[PDB]
Each structure stands twice: as C-alpha cells, then as structure tokens.
Design an enzyme around this catalytic site. Sequence first.
Site, PDB file in Angstrom:
ATOM      1  N   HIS C  43       7.839   0.642   2.491  1.00 11.72           N
ATOM      2  CA  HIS C  43       7.885   1.693   3.536  1.00 11.72           C
ATOM      3  C   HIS C  43       7.432   1.190   4.890  1.00 11.72           C
ATOM      4  O   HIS C  43       7.802   1.805   5.922  1.00 11.72           O
ATOM      5  CB  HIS C  43       7.183   2.992   3.123  1.00 11.72           C
ATOM      6  CG  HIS C  43       5.735   3.072   3.359  1.00 11.72           C
ATOM      7  ND1 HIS C  43       4.830   2.899   2.319  1.00 11.72           N
ATOM      8  CD2 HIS C  43       4.972   3.295   4.476  1.00 11.72           C
ATOM      9  CE1 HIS C  43       3.593   3.089   2.793  1.00 11.72           C
ATOM     10  NE2 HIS C  43       3.684   3.220   4.095  1.00 11.72           N
ATOM     11  N   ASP C  99       7.506   1.275  -4.243  1.00 11.82           N
ATOM     12  CA  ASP C  99       7.239   0.969  -2.784  1.00 11.82           C
ATOM     13  C   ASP C  99       6.681  -0.479  -2.672  1.00 11.82           C
ATOM     14  O   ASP C  99       5.482  -0.626  -2.579  1.00 11.82           O
ATOM     15  CB  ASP C  99       6.236   2.026  -2.397  1.00 11.82           C
ATOM     16  CG  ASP C  99       6.043   1.985  -0.872  1.00 11.82           C
ATOM     17  OD1 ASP C  99       6.869   1.379  -0.210  1.00 11.82           O
ATOM     18  OD2 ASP C  99       5.051   2.601  -0.510  1.00 11.82           O
ATOM     19  N   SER C 198      -1.605   1.439   5.030  1.00 14.18           N
ATOM     20  CA  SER C 198      -0.435   1.179   4.231  1.00 14.18           C
ATOM     21  C   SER C 198      -0.116  -0.322   4.154  1.00 14.18           C
ATOM     22  O   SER C 198      -0.255  -1.035   5.126  1.00 14.18           O
ATOM     23  CB  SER C 198       0.876   1.909   4.717  1.00 14.18           C
ATOM     24  OG  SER C 198       0.508   3.332   4.568  1.00 14.18           O
TER      25      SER C 198
END
Lengths: 10, 29, 252
Positions: C43, C99, C198
């Site tokens: 992502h 992911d 992230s």
Amino acid sequence: DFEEIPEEYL
Amino acid sequence: GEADCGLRPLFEKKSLEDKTERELLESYI
Amino acid sequence: IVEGSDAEIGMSPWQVMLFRKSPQELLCGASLISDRWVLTAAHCLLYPPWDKNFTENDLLVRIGKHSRTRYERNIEKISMLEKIYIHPRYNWRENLDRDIALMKLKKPVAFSDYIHPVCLPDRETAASLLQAGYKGRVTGWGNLKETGQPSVLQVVNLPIVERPVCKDSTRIRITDNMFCAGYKPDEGKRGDACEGDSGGPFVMKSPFNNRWYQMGIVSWGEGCDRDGKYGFYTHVFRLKKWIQKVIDQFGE
Ligand SMILES: *[C@@]1(=O)[C]([O])[N][C][C][C][C][C][C][C][C]([O])[N][C]([C][C]C2=[C][C]=[C][C]=[C]2)C(=O)N2[C][C][C][C]2C(=O)[N][C]1[C][C][C][N]C([N])=[N+]
C-alpha cells in the site's frame, strides 16, 4: 522540515 | 546478508541488552 | 507510534525509511532483509483509491537512521531502487489482503553498527512465537497522536491478540494473511503504530537462538491507540513463499 539530502542522491 | 541476520552489532554481538527487550522475553511465558 | 519511547542508537538496524524525492517527505517505514532487498507494505507504493502509484524513480531508501529529519552525515546510507515487486494477489479493493512488497536496491548496502538485516521467520519460529499474549516490537517515525512527529525513531512492545477479538473489533473482513496486536481496554497499557509507520516491521526476538525475526508489517488500523481497536499487520510467514520466490528468480 526535512533537512536537504545530497544532490548526489537525487 | 541474512546469515548474521537478527544479531545487532551494538547489542547481541557485544552481549548488551536494550532497555525493554526483557518485556518481550518475559511474555514468551 | 503512539505511547512508545525513543529508540536507543542501533536498537533497530534493519529500520528503513521510505523517502519521497519531491516533495521530499517520509512515505513509510520498511525493513532491510539482506544487503540488497527491502520489505515493505504494498500500500506504501500502490493504493489506487488515493491515487497512489509510486515507481522506482519516485523514491529513495534511507538506512541506518535515527533522527526523522536530519541527513545523518556519516551514519545513514541512501540508496536507489532497481525494481519494485508487489504481491500479485495484493487486495487494495477490499481489505489490503496480502499487503506486501519487495524493493531491490540498485547496489548492495554495507553493514555497520547501525545497518544490519533482520531474519525472516521459518515455519517453526512462526509456530512458537505467533501466539496471543506474546509481545512483538514496532518501530517508525509516524505520528505520536491520532490527531505530532517524533524527533527520533520511536519503539513500542505490543501483545499479539486472539483472532476472534481481532475480527470482532472491526467491520473489515480479516484474512489469514493478517494478525492484530495491541492491549485490551482493561489491560491498562497503550500504544499503536500511527500514520507514517506503515510498511515498518513488527519483530520478535527468539528465545531459542536469540535472533530478531520480522513477523509482521504495519498495515492498517482505524484511528491510532483507540480503545477496543487494534493495529493490523501483514503475516510475513504466510507470504514467505512468494518472498523466497522473487529473490530466487530476480536477484540475491
Ligand atoms: C500507514 O501509515 C499508511 O500506510 N498510508 C496512509 C493512510 C492513512 C489514511 C486514513 C484513513 C482511513 C482508512 O481508510 N484506514 C484504513 C482502515 C481500514 C481499511 C480500509 C480499506 C481497506 C482496508 C482497510 C487503512 O488503515 N488504510 C487504508 C490504506 C492504507 C491503510 C493505512 O492508512 N495505513 C497506515 C497505518 C495505520 C496504522 N494504524 C494503526 N495501527 N492504528
């Protein structure tokens, strides 16, 4: 407010 | 370089512990 | 990171900063798994709903960092990417299932006191450690609060939570390629990954060979450090075969 990276990296 | 993987130069490799890793080990009951 | 502490120098030498060339800005965390490969969340590179679609030329990888903002003149090493590899079945459409992404550096980095790779879990390691109640460690330069930014790398230890509890805390459909972590509302300790974290690593230290292993990638959450909510992470061992695969076929 990121300090500049050496042009050599760009 | 995974071979020497996961042994930190300033901790594992000198037999120094970081300030909170024992909280991790004390959880693996 | 919410409710963490500053990391000690060299405490997380596999920590990688994903850095935008222009505007120069922090994109996400990542991790160093060998001298040429970096692991991150898919992502961080590709998220069509937000119009995100980064290419190799778009980015820089910064390794051996401590400070969020200074160029750490004889400590950090900056590299360019040779190629990006996203999991072919990554699901951006519904839930960020799978992911994960690999980035191969243009040139292999040299190890130092501040730059060292983390291990990838084996079947056995995964099996003994990925247990509800067992603590892992997350690191990143993300937000200190949901609503600012640390000066230095932050760390937080958080417990892995039972799959049911994970499932029942949200409306999103959770897959076996994910796990959730954090403390429960009664547990009386806090902390979470937050925006800016992230792609970073969730790691655990083996009690058997006392090596650090990366079990998860910071993937998604709803808010940061909210009661009854948990952060979700890609389950690295489950995607290990695809990882092995791309390295065997494309590089190393
Ligand atoms: C990470 O820092 C980031 O990778 N990129 C920026 C995203 C922040 C935007 C906030 C908006 C809400 C939202 O949609 N959040 C989802 C939550 C659930 C979800 C929606 C759709 C599909 C799957 C899941 C979400 O967290 N994300 C959607 C795309 C990427 C991801 C994300 O925002 N990741 C964050 C890390 C957040 C960690 N949070 C936490 N541990 N509490």
